[PDB]
From a paper:
The dedicator of cytokinesis (DOCK)/engulfment and cell motility (ELMO) complex serves as a guanine nucleotide exchange factor (GEF) for the GTPase Rac. RhoG, another GTPase, activates the ELMO-DOCK-Rac pathway during engulfment and migration. The DOCK-A (DOCK1/2/5) and DOCK-B (DOCK3/4) subfamilies specifically activate Rac and have an Src homology domain at their N-terminus; the Src homology domain is involved in autoinhibition and binding to engulfment and cell motility (ELMO) scaffold proteins. ELMO is structurally divided into two domains: an N-terminal domain (NTD), consisting of the Ras-binding (RBD), ELMO inhibitory (EID), and ELMO domains, and a C-terminal domain (CTD), consisting of the Pleckstrin homology (PH) domain and proline-rich region.
Numbering used by the authors:
A (entry chain D): 530 to 727
B (entry chain E): 819 to 1368
C (entry chain E): 1 to 269
Amino acid sequence: SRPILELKEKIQPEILELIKQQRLNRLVEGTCFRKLNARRRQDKFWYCRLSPNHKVLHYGDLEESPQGEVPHDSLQDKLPVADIKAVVTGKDCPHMKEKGALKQNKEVLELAFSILYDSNCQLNFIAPDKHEYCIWTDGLNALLGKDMMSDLTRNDLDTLLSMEIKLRLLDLENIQIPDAPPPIPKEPSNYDFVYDCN
Amino acid sequence: YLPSIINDVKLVFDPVELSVLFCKFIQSIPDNQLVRQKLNCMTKIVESTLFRQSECREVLLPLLTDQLSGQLDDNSNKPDHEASSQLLSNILEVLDRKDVGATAVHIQLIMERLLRRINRTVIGMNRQSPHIGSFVACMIALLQQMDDSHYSHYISTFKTRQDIIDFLMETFIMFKDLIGKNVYAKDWMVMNMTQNRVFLRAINQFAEVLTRFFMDQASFELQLWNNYFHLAVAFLTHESLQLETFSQAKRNKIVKKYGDMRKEIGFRIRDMWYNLGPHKIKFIPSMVGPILEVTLTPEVELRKATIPIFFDMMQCEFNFSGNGNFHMFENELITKLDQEVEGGRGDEQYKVLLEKLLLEHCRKHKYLSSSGEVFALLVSSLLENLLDYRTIIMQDESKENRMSCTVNVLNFYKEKKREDIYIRYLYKLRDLHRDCENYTEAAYTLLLHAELLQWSDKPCVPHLLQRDSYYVYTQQELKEKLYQEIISYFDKGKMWEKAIKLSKELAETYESKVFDYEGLGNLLKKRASFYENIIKAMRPQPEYFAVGYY
Amino acid sequence: MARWIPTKRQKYGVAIYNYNASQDVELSLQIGDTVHILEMYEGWYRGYTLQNKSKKGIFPETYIHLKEATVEDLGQHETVIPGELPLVQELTSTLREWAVIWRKLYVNNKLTLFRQLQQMTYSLIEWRSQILSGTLPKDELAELKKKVTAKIDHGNRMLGLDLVVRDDNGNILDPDETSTIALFKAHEVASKRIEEKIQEEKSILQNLDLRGQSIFSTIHTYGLYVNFKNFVCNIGEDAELFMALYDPDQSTFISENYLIRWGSNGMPK
């Protein structure tokens, strides 16, 4: 399966772009995200909707909405995607290093993601669980045009690439791929096709 | 139980004597005893021993015909629909059997003994919730089992022409009511295709009978072409490229198994329209519309064949252009074309080939073809306008863009002065602004509509008579009703000044012309509310910005 | 390059791996690129590819796994068994379709039915692989055909896909416009399968006794399997175990006594 494996991993890009468009679709549909220490009458649920243009984010302190995203002008309908330095994950989020009233506890170590913008403004947000945290980070990194950091993303990569090549080798049933590629027979220098082209 | 013996009894007995004995026995049944049971009986009978037919079929069936024709209409067929359907299914199947025996002439006997019968049945058997689908299957199996020569032998050669005319009209309204409100799950695509092929065959046959008994041969009674083209075009209004596209092989599957039925359908319709000859002009303005969509077909070749029909019909009018010209034709053309294209139907290649074809057809021809050239240049302008409209509609999906483009086409029409479709888009934009609650803008639109109206009594054109409600609507009444609604909008538009302005003139029209003072009372009541609002409360001043697009 | 000759014994133009891009009309040709070649060269073959049936590509003979077979597998007797190969090609096509709708799927939150499709796909591909060999008995052929047709038409069903008829032998005999009424009753039988499966999705996907009664209404004879492990009793002498089925309500036995000899050591004799 060495030619098989090299062929499978060598035609990578389609699944990669496929997955990342799926990611950005998920970002656009989004959901109500989570704030910091939204306890004393603070709406911990609030939607962060990416534009279908995928350039502006529709977000802010919306109500405790179980339904999730609601289509309207959010509190802030812009996140400048052209100047997001990065999103810090984990202890790199300064809001975790807060030791006063905004002390995030040790059960949100994997839900910390602060969008860097304005070179001083951040968006320290929380995720309901790890899977969509990684999902959103993947989608943003796609907006960054970079690698994906969801374990589920690698899962999809592997399963779909394996399926795809699996459904390719039906033509080679009862045939073997020579590890050394077959020699290219000499092509006569003349291209005077005796038969008509097309 | 008695059918159980017939097999080996035949094996050791005379075929035809058995046949006639069973026939006489069944005829010995009193006419109101155990109908379903006997139906099952001769079901099993036609099951076996019908492999050898030439000695029994011709004698067994006459009985079956008699009882099924009794089942035709006795006002008590309610119990026997499903059973008689089963009988028909089985008999038609065994007739479709090839090795069983020669039946072509016997197929005819079935024709003349069962065809009009089942037609009248489905006429009565006209509800879709029941097992009607079985009957439809039976009758289509009939129709495919036939032959064109068959179709001709007697069904085409009935008694007086009136009877056959009524029969043909009934068949055609049936076929239209069948293809419309289709009876299948939309999943039995094989059924849909086969039904299309068989309906194609049948409508072909009824087309040649129309030619050979109802052309100038029948110099009069030549209406039914309205129905026939209606049915044909309706049949040409599904099973199109995109359904064909779902799988790539879907195109391939259908074209291999059936080809593009639409192609020969359109060709048949085309040659038929050509065949109409002198009756074309007597028949043009109604059927102008019914041909655009077949011209709009997403294919290429029959379109190439079909645009010339437009020049053919304007030519027909040119022969009639001694009194006027194709103004009637072009008006319907414009209207239809507008609503179909705005329905998201056409494409630019269509417009290019249209221009090419119409211009080429007009070049060979005279002055009136030059007038057609300029009008079709107008047409091409309209086409590109609508195409731009729809591409922006599908492209931005924003209120701003759609209102912008619809206003653009509105102004275009105002230039073109086709006021009716102009009103139509007026109402479209009204719907949009209402969706945005832009009461000011919506009411202004209704104002623009009311502008063309007068306070006269006579409703001058039914063009201003819209689809919202339609009866006499004296010009005065429509104007005042519009004004009323506009006033409502201004009121919830918080612009009471214009409300007052129109309230005054509504009042004066009441006073001088209708003398209905109750309307006065209510109108000015609201007028007082308006003055109260305007002096009493305060409302914010909207800001204005300059947007420079570059 | 010259001397190309039209032929129709190449319908299975088989790639070997992702081809080199040597030709202006060839690329990293995908594994299952069954290409409809039109023209023959000894070392090369150019014609329509499955990816683009309107384009040519000159492909090495050492790269083509030549197959003289055409769309019909009986004229050249390419059938592993007659009347079955149509099924494998059709199911491969449906797998292509399944993958397409699969792309259509994950982008949407249909993951439950998505995974159900996944497991049906696994079952179908393994059934395909095993029946690629004709080693199965005729009863196995019939049973596989029935169940695979059921599964595949069900897959068409919940995906809103059109259906096929002619349960056995390639599902193609009926759609060959042989009849018209037999076609209608075939469509009715298939839709009956459809209604069966739509009512039994909530019957088996949720409950487990309805399938038991349905299967048990198809067979009349049954066998209870008893696998003894060890006898835990304090006797100290030889023991005879008369194992059988009994009816407490009827106060009688239902099966003959099965005699087990048990030794005095705690072990069977």
